[PDB]
C-alpha cells in the first residue's frame, strides 16, 4: 500500500552527483542526522526546475537544523552531472548545494512507492527520515504539483519538537 | 497508493450537522475532496486540527471542496464528541462530516491504518472531480497539518486543472 | 468459532479504564480469581450503560465471591475514559468501579468470536473464567437485549458450588 | 461463526412426541419462537431435573408463541424407553415438548456444542426467532443446570424490543 | 484401507457395563485370550436382545473356551446399564453375562469399519481376535438378520485347532 | 470394508463352467441370490474340500434360488487344469460349481479380499439378493475353511425376512 | 517406459519351483554368472511349455556358457509345481531342470515391464544380463509368438564374446 | 512400451536413394515395418549390420515388409556416409530408407535414446500393416543383430495374422 | 535468455528524438524496411557518442540498402533531445541522422535482452531485423567495446541476398 | 539472459584434435581468449568454408592467446569422418582446431543457439576471456555465415580495452 510512519525507512543505496563529482552513497551514512529524500520526474524537463533548486538555496535552513536534504531520480549520474553543469538561463540546474542521486535501476522510487510504471518516471514525493533512520513523513504529490520550502522547515520543527 | 490514479472507494456512516447519513465518494462527484485521518476521539491535536479545518472550511467551499475527517471510532463516539463543547474537550458543532470507520475498511484501504493500536495515523488526501487521487500527505501520528498548506496545494492542482 | 466450556479461556491483554485511569492488563493477573468477561457493541450508547451500571453497583457481590468482572468494547481507551467520565444525566457511565477494556485491535472479541464483521462491534457476550484460566460459560446476546446481573451469580455460585 | 444475527442452523431429525416417532424440523417452527436445549446423555441424574423442569413450565412457552425442543445425541428408542421410565424410579415421566434424537450428530456439530472427548453435547441453549434468525446463545459446562426463568425474561426481552 | 483377517485387529478403549457397573477397557486388557466382538445397531430395539442374551446364555462355552465376548453400541453407558436393569419382560435385557461396551465417539465401529453413516449406528458385525490381538474372523449381517452362537463356536474351535 | 445395505460391487471375468470357459457377469444372476466366495489358490489343500462340500450341496443352493460362484486369482487355465485332475492328486474331480477367474485381482480387490503380501485372497463369502444388493459378509483367514450349513441359513433367513 | 541395455537389471526376489520343491531365489544368488530370464503368460497352455521344455533340454548348453536359465510366470509356486509334476505327454513340463518362478503379486512382471494390464499376463518377454546384474539384452514378443534357444544361446555368445 | 499396442509415430527426413525425403509410418500402412537404430554414423560394427540387411532387402519385401535404418545423425551425415564406398569406410549405396532423427524424438518416443550420449541403442520394432507394434528388441551397443532371426520373427507373426 | 534468429523480433514503441522533435515510433511502422536496432548504455557518456556518430554520418549507405537504423538508450527522450542539441565540441551528438529511441520504461531493453540488472543500463546490443519483422542478427557487445558500420553493412549485405 | 559480463557457460566434450579423440572442457583454457563458435551441421556447404577460414588463420589467434573451438551437434564420429575428407571433396582437409562435438545437445542448448526446429545449432560465435567470463554475443541465421576480420577486431578491442 503506503509506507508507513514510525517504522524504519528502505534503505537506499546509489550513485550521486556531489559538488560536481559521483560518489556512492546510502541512507546509513546518515545514521544521527534528519534527511529530506524527495524525487522528481526528469532531468531536462520542467521546463524551469524551481522546486529543487529552491531546496538547494535553502539548504542552510536544513543544515542547521542537523538534516541532509537528498534530490532523487531514475536518471543518470552522467544526465544528472550535465543537467548539473548547465546554468539556470539555459535551462539547467546551475551548480546544486544538494546532492543528485541517480536511481537507474528504478528499485530506489520503487522502494519508496513513489514508481509510475506509466513513463517509468518517479512522482514527486517528499519522505521524512529521522536520525536513526525512521520513517516519519510521506508527501507524495501529482507530477505537476510541487512542493514547499516551508512547510518542510514546519514539520521538521515538529517532529524535532517531538523528539526533545 | 499513487497519484493520478482513481481514488480508493469508500462508503462510511458519517455525522454531519448533528445527526447521522451514509455517505460515499461518488456522492461529491463534481468537486474536490479533501479526506482526511486522526487517529482517535476524545484526544489532544486531532480535536485542534478538526476544529482548525471546520472553521477554515468557507475557504473550502469557495474553491468547490469537500472537507471530511476520519476515524476508526463508531458513529456514537464521533456524535457524543460533535455535542460536547469546545471548551469541554469537545468539537462545538462541527461544519464538515465526521466520517466513521469501525470496520477499518476505509483506513486499511487508504493504507492509513495502524496494525499497532489499531488507529489511524494522520493521513490527508486530495481527490479531484473525477474521483482521482491528486495527493498523499501522511504524517507519524504526534505531528499536525496544515489548512494552509492544503489550501495552497488545492489552488495549485485547480490552477493546473486549467 | 463457538468457544467450548472445559477448554482453557483465550489469552487477553491490552488497555484498560481503572479508577479513571488507563493501565494494562491481561487474563494471567486474575490467575486465583474468577472472571466475568462482558462484552458490548458501543459506547455512548442505551441499552449498554445500564447493563455497566448495573454490573458496577453490584460489584462487591462479585468481590465477595473472588471474581472479577470485566467489560470490553472495540471502542479506545480514550472513548472510554471520556464515557466514564460523563456523568449518567449527560449519558455517561458516572463513575465506574470495574475495569473498562478496550479491544481497539478487534483481537479480544475475535478471540472470543463475539465479534461481528457487520458493523465492527461485538455482540453482547459474557464468559465465566475460573481461577485457572478454564472456560466455564458462554453467553452471547443480540444487540438490543441486556444480560442479568442475578443471573450471572447464580452460574457463579454454581461453578464454585462444583469446583470443590 | 456462531452469532446471533444470523439464520439458526437447520436442523431435521426424529423426536418423541406425545409417545410417538415423529420427524421434525427448524422450518416447521415459523411464525414461532424455539427454545433449543441440548443435554450429555439419557438416563442421567442433572439432565432429567432440566427436561422436566422446561416441561412442567410448557405453557409459560406456549403463552409467549414459543416452542421448547430437547436434543441429545442418543437414539429415539433410548429416547422413547426414558420417557416410559416413571418420574420416580429417575424417567422422565411423559414429556410436553418433543425430545430429539441425533445419532449422527449433525445438530450438536451444526449448533457446536458437540465435544470430540466424549460422545456427548455440552448444556446448550439456543433461542430462535420466528423468523429462523438466531438470537440467544448459552452453554454451559456440564455440570452446571439452566434456569427457565432466565429463558423466559430473555424470551420477554427479545419479544419487547421487537 | 481395508482390515483383514492376518493383521492385528484394531485397538479399541471404552466405557463399559461389567456386572451392573462402569469399568473402562481396552483390547489389550484381553491379550492372553481369545476374544469375540459383536457389534448391535442400537439399545431398547427388537432383534438385538434376544441376539445378545443368546450369547450371554452360552457364555460358558466361550469361557471354556477361552473367549471374552464384548457387546458393541453406539450408546452411552447410561443408556446400556439402562437397558441392562430393565427386567426382559419390559424388553430389557435383564442382566447380562457379557460386558456392554459404548462407542459413543462412533471410533470403534468405524475402526472396524462396521459404521454406517446413515444412521449413528452399526451394522451388525462380529470379529474373531486371538490371544496377540490378531484378527481371525470377520463376519457382517444385514441388520434384518441375526447371528449364531453355533457357528461362532465351530470358528472357535477351528482357529484354537490351528493355534 | 464393505456394508450390507449397498449395492454389490460389479465383477465381469473369465470363468470354467461344465469344463469350458464362459465370460460371466454379477448382472447375468440377477433375479437370483449369489454366493461369491473366495479361495487362495489352486493346488492347495483345505480349498478342495471347500470347493468340493460346497460343489455337493449345490441342490441345495438350486432350490433356494441361489448361485454359488467359486473365485481365486488363478487363471482360467489353472481353474481349468484343477478341475480336470482327480480327488486323489488334489485336484477338484467335476465341478457343479462355476470356477471365476480373477487374474487382474480386480474382484478380489473390489470384494476387500486381497492379500498384499502372497497376492492372493483370504476365504470371502458374500451373500448378494436378486437385486444386486449386499447382504451377507463373511471372511475367514486362510487355515479356516466355511460352513455350507452356515451359508443356507443365512440364505434361509434373508429369504425369511425378505 | 521399457527397460535399457548398460543399466542394472531391476533385482527380482520370490518362490521359484527347483528339483520338484519350493526354494526362495533372487537375482543376487546368481551375481558371478549370466542370466536369462524369461517369461510366458500362463500356465497350462500350449506354446508356453513348448519354449520352457525347449529351454530345459538345452540347460546344459547354457550351463558351459556359465549362464542360468530361469522361466518367470503370474501363476502362483503351486500351480507351477503341479505343472511340473504332469508329463510332458499330458500337456505338463516333464521335471525342469530350470527355476520355474512365480511372481503371484506380479512384481517381477512389472519390474521388467512386460506386465500386461489388459488379461493379468506378462508378454513373453527375454532379458539377458550379465554377472555384475547388468542388463544387456531386452527381447519382448507378442503373446501368439514364441522364441528360438538358438538365437538366445548366439546373443550369449556374443556378448561374452565382447566381455 | 507393449507389443499389443499401436506403434509411436515416427516422421522425419529419409536418404531413399541419395536424395532428401519426408518419410512418417502412417505413410507405410498396409505393409509391415521393421524399423532399428544403431548408435552413430561412421563407425564400426553399424554398417555391417545396415548392409547385411540391404543385401538381403528382397527377403523383405517378398513378406511385404518395409525396412527402415534410423540413427540420431542428421541427413548429411546419412547421406555423406551412404555415397561413400564401403572400401573407403562408408555403406556402398544401400536399398533402405535412412532416417535421420536430429531432434531425438523418435528414438525417445521408442524408448532405444541412450542419455550418457547422443545416441540410440540398436532398437528393433516390428510393426503390422495397421501400425500396431508386435515385436520389441533391444540390444546393447556392442552387440549386432540377426536378419535370419528378424525374418523368423517376421513369418511368426504373418502365420499368426 | 538470448534471442534467436527466424523468429519475429520483439515489438517496440517508443518515444524517440527525431529531428529535434518528440514523435512516437513502433517497429510495425518499418514493414518493408530492414531495421538495425542498436543499443548504447547512456547518454553523455565519454566515448559513446563517437561510435553513435559513425553510425550517424554513414546513414546513406543503410538509406540505399533499405535499413532504417534506429539507436536506443534507457534514458528519457529529454536526455536524448538534451545530448542531440549539444555540439560534439562538448561533446554531445551534433545534431543526429537517426531516430533516438527512449526506453524509459526499460520494456525494449529487457525485452531484447540487452539490459542489465547491475548498472541498469543496456549493453552494446545491435539486432538486424528483415522487413516482416523477423529477427535475424544478434550482437552483443561488452559496454567498453564499440561496434562497426562495415560489418554490420556485411551482414545487412548478406541477408538481403539469401532474401532472394 | 546470455549477457556479456557473466561468466560464460560451462562446456565439456568430445573433441577431434590432429585427428585424435581428446575430451575438453572450458576451464582446460584459463589464460587464454577463446573463441567457441557453432554451425548447424557436419557435411554441408557454408560451414565447411567458415571452418576452413578460421583454422587456416590459427596462428593469428595463437599469437592473439586465442584458442578458436568449432562446435556441432553431430557426433566426434561424424567430425572425424568429415575431417578426414579432402577439401575438393568436401572434406575439411586437415583441422588446426577443436572439433567439438555436443551429441547431447548441453552445449548448444546452454549457449541458447540451439534451434528445437532442428536439433542443429544456429551459428553462434562467443569470445570469452581469460578469467572463463563472456565478452562478445553474436547469433546468426543459418544461411548467413561469419568474418574471421571481424572477430580479430573484437579480440584486439577487448584485449586493448583489458590489457
Redesign the interface.
Known sequence: ??????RPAPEFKGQAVINGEFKEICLKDYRGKYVVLFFYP????FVSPTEIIAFSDQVEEFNSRNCQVIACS???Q??H???DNLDRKSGGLGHMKIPLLA????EISKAY??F??E???A?RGLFIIDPNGIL???????????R?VD?TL??LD??QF?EK
Do not use: C, H
Open positions: 500500500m503506503v509506507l508507513l510512519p514510525n526528469a532531468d531536462f524537463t531514475t536518471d543518470s552522467y544526465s552531472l550535465a543537467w536511481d537507474r535501476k528504478q512507492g513513489v509510475d510504471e513513463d517509468g518516471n512522482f516519519r513523513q510521506i508527501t507524495i504529490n501529482d507530477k505537476p504539483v510541487g514547499s512547510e514546519r514539520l515538529a517532529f517531538v
